[PDB]
């Protein structure tokens, strides 16, 4: 077959350089971008059906996730309504449904509970004033999140969600599922547990829940259990029996309607003391300017909430964009969601993002442009102004049960943890650390810890790389580690060291130790011994994988070269990239008799050059 | 001359694997290690002189740095005495002088002031009780630092000081010099400034200092200014006139002696209301167990103090070890300094490390084994029990002036910042960020911010690497970027992409964008267009610099291969290391018709294999 034949001079870097010479309408993405391009002839019907279905789903989801946040039911309707309108303009995606997404809602509720506890606020009971304070804190956090998102959009730094690695995303998702389960289990049992704010909050909440389980409400617990069983069974049947009924069954909506009708018919509120929403405001409240003074106490939480909400939004947007063959602008997603969160925070809402289930409902029911979003917003509006009184007898345990039933996919990544461990130990470590940190910390603090742990794992992987003592495969130009192939011959009086990482301070110390181990000695000790009195003659450094190089690395390279030259040992560098050589030359490496003539193209010109002497 | 000639088959990874087959008395380092090995015949005289000189220096330095800490003068004597004895046993180094090192002292004093303010403690004035509380807090912090250091010694994690990069070390050093200058300027002016704890503390301290400058004491200011001028002038003359007097002149000791004698003679305390130490305890106080309850409020500070103190200790130890041709055990340095800090914290001392100036004094005066340290400790002892009354009239402004005069070398790295910027922009950015963060934050918080900023810079450098579209140098096996050499020929219908970094999630997105830019299109869009209807035929991925690889990277590689195979474009991988291929095979890469036959040794076997078809 084909053979590897090449005839050329031995080029050093100096010789190679000598012979081969070197050397305005998108920030506000208009609705006019697609409204004139709209397809009125047929798209209206699909948009209307999809919007009605996803609005029916989104009213329920906003009401349910308003319990995850520490705000009364009814403001979830606002959080489902306002962000859709203020995303219809700036939004790039045309399939995602904008709403609470109970993970962001639970982080918001954790912030609100930390900044407005029951005992800290009410010292008399002042339900109305406490609810007003909780709503105001939620609106302030939403406005801060929107400001952060808009700032990130202005700076065009949309690559930050790259840092949200899949292992840490999965660990954070499982931990958030655990937190949501704990909160909604507190809700369904109708047990009054004092809210623990800080570290080990979830564990203390569980301890108090199982302590006060004796005070559980039978009606609320039974309703929640029955709702969970019905929803999960219907979802399982739909997953199995999937060839028919292409649209997913809106089991949650029907379950909530039946529960509300039954609770209105037999009046669980007064007969069994059931926990119902008991209050939904009618009409739209006037806007209020959030107090910016609280911004200092929400920074570490607003940053994490903005990052998580945007990551979920673009995740769902990209999942549906690769399906419908279009691209979503990430920086414009910053802009759209930041403006949306600011607008919603002014109008008394909590942080807005998209939900995978709601987006799936919207798309599977004839998903088309964001007009379906507008129809969903109109449905939420008519629920706000007309259907507010009808949903009063509905139990909060039903909404919590709906959320718990939806938590299954988020609970299932414990199954993929072991295969992650088998595939790559550091990824499983990232997963487990993110999960545990998000459990015994805040969810925001857990996210920040997971991000910095991912950064630390990258730093450790580049700091302790693979390094090999290379010898030649006979009659070829293939150099491989002498301990791996058993047919590798060691050349005459020269050691070849491949350091498979960029050289920086941690890699400085690692590379010094690796050279000392490879050559079997160190230059300083032998030089001092020879001075007091008064095996290897060359070391080739295979730097093919050296990506970058800093001033500490350049200093280390100069020190290594000088120390080995002191004991008549020549150090040659091979396979260095052009930019690394430029870094060397601008860092002052080529001074004091270096002259770039000890740099070869690969680790075979070095050996040939040695054999010439 | 020598020519590059090689004849071999074209090996893929599969073919290459087919033909070439693969596959108890040191933790307590005894004084008995060198006491029997001691050289009594001649080493006693050198040890005695060096110990007396360095003890005379260390008494003054401990007294001066006790002002950097928020403890009364006299406990610096204990901090200079006890750690030396408890380091004489476990210490590896035999040249460093154990003591306060005013940077660690200032961080300790910042912690103590934050945990014991004047207004928070004294509400009546209770100088004695406030001093006792400050001393107890300092001892608690010292014990916590020693516990952390001993734990780090048990875990053998001595590579952590590698993360203290030279740029961030320099920035932190300059910021610490600024903080020390501010504190000692507050001391010399004898102006009562309320202590600002937290962020922008140094700026507020300066504002109040220049506001209250009208209350300055003329005698203290003049004494401090004269001491500074004398010390700096003598140091400059010694640096210039250096051929004679090999031992550095102990100008600080003579200056302090003269100042104390003058203040005793003419009684500045009552005549000019000068700020003198006014109190030094006689004898050794009994030990007290620090209250562990405060450990929760010192963790982020104790960690940074331990890291900084150990880093300084091993820095000086290595500087003198490479001079005297010996090696110091870093993990045993953890053990020794942790035991020393625990012992000192029990006996009412603040955190102990080494000082470069004191170590230079000890070594230059006949530096020998740690017996000189014991002699210095004895000198400090006789100062504690006898010379305590003699040093009472000494002004604290003199000690602050001594520290300010010594601050020059720490202030001089602003000169090396611009050359750092010229050499490597990221290193200068690390320097400036560390300096600014340590300025507008705590010094401990500044150190932590600098550490995680260095980690972030490493992550960013590996996340946005150099990537090149490679073409062949004619009649050779040299492939270089087509835009750099102007003699590079692009092969027939194939693009070669070198991605000079390990592939991870950030690098996943970067590499996808790089491939899309190089080939001039993306696989998904063209595949979808062809499906709706119903330039490049190969892409070689030069992965020579790919160091590691994670599950996200493996998934990305599989997705890229499948997407390009969908449009009849073959993707070949070349120059991959053996461990990266092992990572691929254990991550499930070689499934669904991959079979390792698309992996070549270098980017010349790929081109030859293409030319075979
Ligand atoms: C882009 C990259 C990421 C950016 C991240 C940005 C984080 C910003 C943090 C901001 C910060 C530190 C600033 C310095 C941080 C240095 C870190 C160095 C790190 C080095 C790598 C501000 O610190 C000070 O906090 C004061 C309050 O304590 C605040 O209020 C004071 O003045 C007011 C008038 O101005 C006056 O009205 C008010 O009365 C005063 O008190 C001050 O204004 C403010 O300066 C800390 O505050 C954050 O908020 C909470 C405070 O309690 C705290 O909440 C947590 O509570 C749960 C437990 O209970 C926990 O479980 C939750 O999680 C979380 O809800 C957060 O934890 C904390 O973080
Ligand atoms: C190896 C790797 C590194 C390890 C680093 C270890 C850091 C440990 C920090 C510990 C910590 C956070 C824990 C969670 C951190 C999560 C981080 C996530 C990061 C994600 C990227 C504990 O948080 C809680 O703090 C409470 C006090 O507030 C403390 O006391 C409570 O219970 C007691 C009875 O137990 C009871 O007696 C007490 O009355 C209670 O109040 C609790 O016990 C404790 O749990 C924060 O505490 C640290 O100490 C100070 C507190 O004020 C604070 O001091 C600063 O003040 C200056 C300004 O004034 C500032 O300028 C200085 O710098 C610094 O002096 C620190 O800043 C803070 O850090
Ligand atoms: C500070 C903030 C919080 C940080 C918390 C800690 C975060 C980091 C956590 C630690 C890393 C955890 C990685 C995942 C655990 C193993 C998962 C797995 O595959 O199950 C295997 C079980 O095998 C084991 O569990 C043993 C190996 C892992 C534990 C080693 C000792 C830990 C010492 C540290 C204490 C069996 O599955 P297999 O595939 O058959 O093999
Ligand atoms: C606030 C933040 C502050 C900064 C961060 C602080 C935290 C920093 C955290 C960093 C800790 C990193 C630990 C893991 C290092 C790499 C592990 C690995 O397999 O890589 C290499 C081996 O690794 C080594 O050889 C390392 C040295 C060995 C001894 C280590 C101590 C254990 C003693 C054990 C004692 C016995 C009990 C091998 O890699 P490869 O060649 O690819 O194969
Ligand atoms: C949050 C915690 C605190 C973080 C603080 C910020 C930390 C990071 C700081 C920023 C990086 C600072 C690097 C050092 C500054 C330049 C030093 C230098 O060589 O002097 C050159 C001056 O040239 C300049 O100063 C212009 C270039 C630098 C500034 C660009 C805009 C900054 C926008 C950001 C606002 C001239 O010298 P030359 O060699 O002739 O060239
Ligand atoms: C708690 C922790 C939380 C998570 C971390 C949070 C912080 C995350 C921080 C990360 C921020 C990293 C910024 C620097 C990125 C690399 C810079 C560089 O030269 O590398 C490459 C270019 O860089 C790019 O191409 C990048 C994309 C370009 C646009 C970027 C936005 C600016 C828009 C400007 C708008 C105009 C105004 C080039 O590298 P090379 O090939 O080697 O040459
Ligand atoms: C890019 C890097 C970003 C790093 C961001 C770091 C954010 C942390 C700042 C300070 O840390 C928090 O401070 C709170 C101050 O209140 C603590 O609450 C505490 O407040 C109570 C009262 O002090 C304590 O008793 C409780 O332990 C606890 O809830 C909380 O635990 C602690 O985490
Ligand atoms: C490897 C990752 C390591 C992460 C380490 C994170 C350490 C920070 C934890 C909490 O942060 C601190 O909390 C203090 C709580 O007291 C704040 O003091 C504050 O206390 C006063 C009272 O609340 C405020 O008014 C002042 O702004 C300020 O001094 C201080 O500013 C803030 O930094
Ligand atoms: C389809 C789903 C949503 C219907 C939910 C309706 C709810 C309100 C119904 C369904 C099951 C019912 C419970 C069934 C049995 C009992 C025991 C009886 O001694 C008191 C009433 C009580 C506790 C009922 C309360 C109301 C209840 C919880
Ligand atoms: C509310 C409290 C109780 C939640 C506690 C959650 C913790 C304990 C759980 C959540 C996910 C779990 C991990 C999921 C999967 C695996 C792989 C298998 O080899 C068992 C261990 C390991 C690594 C688990 C360890 C325990 C774990 C981290
Ligand atoms: C070890 C390997 C072979 C297990 C393979 C099956 C995996 C997917 C299953 C089997 C049993 C499961 C564990 C059973 C019980 C618990 C406790 C609870 O906290 C949930 C997670 C955890 C820890 C599960 C994680 C996933 C798990 C480990
Ligand atoms: C990858 C890096 C960034 C992770 C850093 C995590 C660190 C800062 C966190 C993780 C868990 C935290 C601990 C959790 C619980 C407690 C108990 C409390 O009474 C004092 C604080 C203390 C002791 C915390 C100190 C800080 C801590 C150790
Ligand atoms: C060698 C060094 C350390 C000697 C220091 C001695 C100190 C105590 C001496 C040196 C210079 C002296 C000052 C010189 C001039 C004056 C002005 C006079 O109207 C009041 C006394 C006053 C303010 C003196 C106070 C004491 C003083 C500050
Ligand atoms: C107490 C307060 C006033 C201290 C403030 C210190 C700050 C402002 C100082 C300390 C060191 C300084 C840097 C030192 C050196 C250089 C290089 C030169 O190109 C000027 C800018 C730059 C980058 C300086 C910027 C300002 C700087 C960061
Ligand atoms: C820009 C290049 C050419 C300067 C070369 C000379 C360097 C070493 C000198 C010249 C002038 C110096 C600056 C003069 C003034 C200040 C303000 C103060 O905060 C100290 C640092 C700083 C910022 C100095 C840093 C170092 C400096 C920039
Ligand atoms: C490289 C990474 C780890 C560095 C992270 C540094 C971050 C966490 C620090 C650096 C400077 C800090 C800010 C300094 C000053 C203030 C003003 C105060 O009123 C509120 C907090 C606030 C706004 C701080 C928030 C946190 C902050 C932005
Ligand atoms: Cl979902
Ligand atoms: Cl849900
Ligand atoms: Cl020094
Ligand atoms: Cl000094």
Author numbering:
A (entry chain C), B (entry chain D): 17 to 39, 64 to 164, 176 to 585, 654 to 732
Paper text:
Pendrin (SLC26A4) is an anion exchanger that mediates bicarbonate (HCO3−) exchange for chloride (Cl−) and is crucial for maintaining pH and salt homeostasis in the kidney, lung, and cochlea. Pendrin also exports iodide (I−) in the thyroid gland. Pendrin mutations in humans lead to Pendred syndrome, causing hearing loss and goiter. Here, we present structures of pendrin from Sus scrofa (ssPendrin), which is 90% identical to human pendrin, in complex with either I−, HCO3−, or Cl−; ssPendrin in the apo-state; and ssPendrin in the presence of NFA, which inhibits anion transport.
The structures of ssPendrin in the presence of I−, HCO3− or Cl− were determined by cryo-electron microscopy (cryo-EM) to an overall resolution of 2.8 Å, 2.7 Å, and 2.5 Å, respectively. Since the three structures have only minor differences, we describe the Cl−-bound ssPendrin here. The final structural model includes residues 17 to 39, 64 to 585, and 654 to 732, which resolves all 14 transmembrane helices and their connecting loops and most of the STAS domain. TM3 and TM10 cross roughly in the center of the membrane, and together with residues from TM1 and TM8, form a cradle for substrate anions. The anion in S1 is coordinated by the backbone hydrogens of Leu407 and Ser408 and the side chain hydroxyl hydrogen of Ser408. The side of the aromatic ring of Phe141 from TM3 is within 4.0 Å of S1 and could stabilize the anion in S1 by anion-π interactions. The anion at the S2 position is coordinated by the sidechain hydroxyl hydrogen of Tyr105 and sidechain amide hydrogens of Gln101 and Asn457. While the anion in S1 is coordinated within the transport domain, the anion of S2 involves residue Asn457, which is on TM12 from the scaffold domain. In all three ssPendrin structures, the anion binding sites are solvent accessible from the intracellular side through a large cavity formed between the transport and scaffold domains. Thus, the structures of ssPendrin are captured in the inward-facing conformation.
